[PDB]
């Protein structure tokens, strides 16, 4: 016979790239947008803006 | 579920113990009316009683397995001939196959085409046999494996078609398409050259709902060499008279000879031009008949695997009406 050596995702190395969080109701609330912005830094230049 | 047909008959052409279940069977017309309709159907010049003789040379028996019919045609791979010959139990079988070949070749010669002599039933699944008398049972609608065979090794079945005859179309025509659900068509190929003619069988699958132009191009050589050698043995007259040219210049002539109705027997109306449409020996439609097809159902997949065969995949039986292919 032949076994099936299963693999776990978290135990891989790639897992460090993305963060995985279990959101259960996504399939329902995905009907619209979520639309969060992030940021941008800005240097304080001299002279009046 | 699916619904079935049972038809008691003779173990002449389909021999349900020799083959295992899962192969299409055909219903054969009573030959008396074929022999009769010949008397009025064979074209001029040809023989008008040769089908009578060809039938009398083969002496109810009603069904015929496609596995048997494909052997008695031009196209066939000799492995299947050997199988049918040495694997059928029955006496005198090869001789009968030869006679059946002669029958079909007579049928096309007499312009009573076999597609008007073989309605198609579903795939057989069961049978009980006496000595040379059987009662086959085939599906008629629904999918094949809704049935229940009394084998007890494989309750359900599939559909088996001799891979020698299965001609795919899409991958043939290179439509660039992607295999999804495809139709299934059983097609006949006629060829007409007096005393030198034959019949070719195929089983065609494709996504094309309307064959038409597809076969018209697929069988181009057959239509070509059939339209020209088909009118043979018909006495055509000499060069057509110039009076045969149907006059068109005279429709919107304001000044022209005219004749109201109600004075057309033999009055002083002889001044009308004569036109004799004279058609005697030209190619009629039955002269240019080259193929005929009929829809069988829908198919997922075809795999080839063993004598070579071709197992269907989720065949849904939906039989349609016959179709001519002449233009």
């Amino acid at each position: 016979c032949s076994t099936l050596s299963l693999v776990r995702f978290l135990e891989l190395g790639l897992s460090v790239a993305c963060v995985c969080t279990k959101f259960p109701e996504l399939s329902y609330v995905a009907e619209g947008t979520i639309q969060f912005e992030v940021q941008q830094p800005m240097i304080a230049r001299d002279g009046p803006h | 579920r699916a619904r079935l047909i049972r038809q008691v008959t003779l173990a002449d052409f389909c021999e349900p113990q020799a083959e295992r279940p899962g192969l299409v069977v055909l219903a054969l017309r009573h030959p008396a009316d074929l022999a009769g309709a010949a008397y009025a159907a064979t074209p001029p010049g040809k023989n008008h009683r040769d089908l009578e003789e060809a039938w009398l040379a083969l002496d109810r028996a009603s069904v015929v397995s496609l596995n048997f019919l494909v052997a008695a045609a031009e196209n066939a791979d000799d492995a299947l001939r050997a199988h049918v010959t040495t694997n059928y139990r029955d006496r005198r079988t090869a001789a009968r196959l030869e006679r059946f070949a002669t029958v079909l070749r007579a049928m096309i010669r007499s312009h009573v085409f076999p597609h008007r002599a073989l309605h198609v039933l579903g795939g057989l699944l069961g049978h009980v046999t006496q000595d040379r008398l059987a009662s086959v049972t085939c599906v008629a609608r629904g999918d094949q494996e809704a049935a229940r065979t009394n084998d007890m090794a494989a309750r359900r079945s599939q559909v088996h078609v001799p891979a020698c005859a299965l001609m795919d179309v899409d991958r043939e025509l290179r439509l660039g398409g992607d295999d999804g659900l495809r139709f299934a068509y059983l097609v006949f190929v006629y060829t007409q050259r007096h005393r030198r003619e034959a019949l070719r069988v195929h089983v065609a699958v494709s996504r094309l709902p309307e064959l038409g132009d597809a076969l018209s191009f697929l069988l181009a050589g057959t239509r070509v060499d059939n339209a020209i050698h088909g009118t043979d043995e018909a006495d055509a007259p000499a060069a057509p008279a110039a009076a045969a040219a149907f006059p068109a210049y005279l429709f919107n002539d304001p000044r022209s000879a005219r004749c109201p109705t109600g004075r057309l027997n033999t009055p002083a109306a002889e001044a009308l031009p004569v036109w004799a449409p004279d058609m005697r020996g030209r190619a009629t439609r039955n002269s240019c008949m080259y193929a005929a097809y009929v829809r069988l159902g829908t198919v997922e997949r075809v795999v080839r695997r063993a004598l070579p065969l071709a197992h269907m995949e989720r065949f849904t039986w939906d039989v349609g009406a016959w179709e001519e292919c002449f233009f």
Binding site: - | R3, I5, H30, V120, R141, A236, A244, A248, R282, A283
Partner: protein, 267 residues
């Protein structure tokens, strides 16, 4: 889906006579749950063309068992997974197991159920296999073609003689069909010959064939063309030749002679 029909109280014996046609087909007008003997009825003798144009605008239905109070029926085009139903044969010749059944008006001497009790009349169409149905009409019109200026069908060994004209009310019931079917064909012929005039001068053995083959591969005439296309499509559509049944007789003799019932599955 099933429809019941309000049978008025007719009479003894003639109701028992209707109790013999428990497999005929009758055209409803609307899928519903309540009907009456008056609407499902046609005059006993009329032109085959109006009956044909009526059979395309209505809904078919088969007569099931009939209790003297009301009679049940089920349409054909719609069904649940294509169930089984028996269908009494009425044709002139038999149909064998594994055929396609059509419904054409009675081109031959008709049959008209004369309800002298209730002062109605019933007229049922005929059942034919497609092969012979496409040819019986042609035999009928061919017989009239010559009289405008032999007849044998063969079926399952035996042979029929196409009863002579006006053996019934008259042959007037099948005139308009003759006239249209000849006129439209003559039209197609003449228009085609006008479009390519020299078609009939080519060499009958070689030139004509080369034309018909190189064509298979790589008062305004055009108004007449449009009119002819329209009329030919309209007439070809209303000619039956579209099976609505397929006989599937299981556990029974492979042939059903004219008169007795048979188990058929709807397409």
């Amino acid at each position: 889906m099933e429809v019941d029909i309000a049978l008025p109280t007719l009479s003894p014996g003639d109701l028992s006579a209707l109790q013999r046609c428990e497999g005929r087909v009758v055209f409803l007008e609307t899928l519903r749950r309540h009907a009456t003997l008056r609407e499902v009825a046609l005059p006993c003798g009329g032109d085959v063309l109006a009956a044909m144009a009526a059979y395309r605008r209505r809904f078919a239905a088969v007569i099931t068992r009939v209790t003297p109070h009301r009679m049940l029926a089920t349409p054909l085009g719609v069904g649940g997974r294509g169930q089984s139903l028996v269908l009494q044969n009425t044709g002139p010749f038999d149909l064998t197991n594994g055929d396609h059944v059509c419904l054409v008006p009675p081109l031959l001497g008709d049959e008209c159920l004369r309800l002298t009790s209730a002062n109605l009349e019933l007229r049922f169409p005929m059942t034919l296999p497609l092969a012979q149905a496409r040819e019986l009409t042609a035999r009928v019109v061919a017989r009239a073609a010559e009289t405008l200026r032999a007849d044998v069908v063969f079926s399952n060994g035996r042979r029929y003689q196409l009863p002579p004209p006006h053996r019934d009310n008259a042959e007037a019931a099948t005139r308009s069909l003759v006239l249209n079917m000849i006129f439209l064909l003559n039209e197609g012929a003449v228009i085609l010959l006008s479009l390519i005039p020299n078609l009939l001068t080519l060499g009958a053995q070689d030139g004509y064939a080369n034309a018909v083959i190189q064509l298979g591969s790589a008062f305004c005439v055009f108004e007449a063309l449009e009119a002819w296309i329209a009329s030919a499509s309209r007439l070809g559509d209303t000619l039956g030749t579209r099976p609505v049944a397929r006989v599937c007789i299981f556990d029974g003799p492979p042939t059903v002679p004219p008169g007795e019932k048979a188990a058929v599955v709807e397409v």
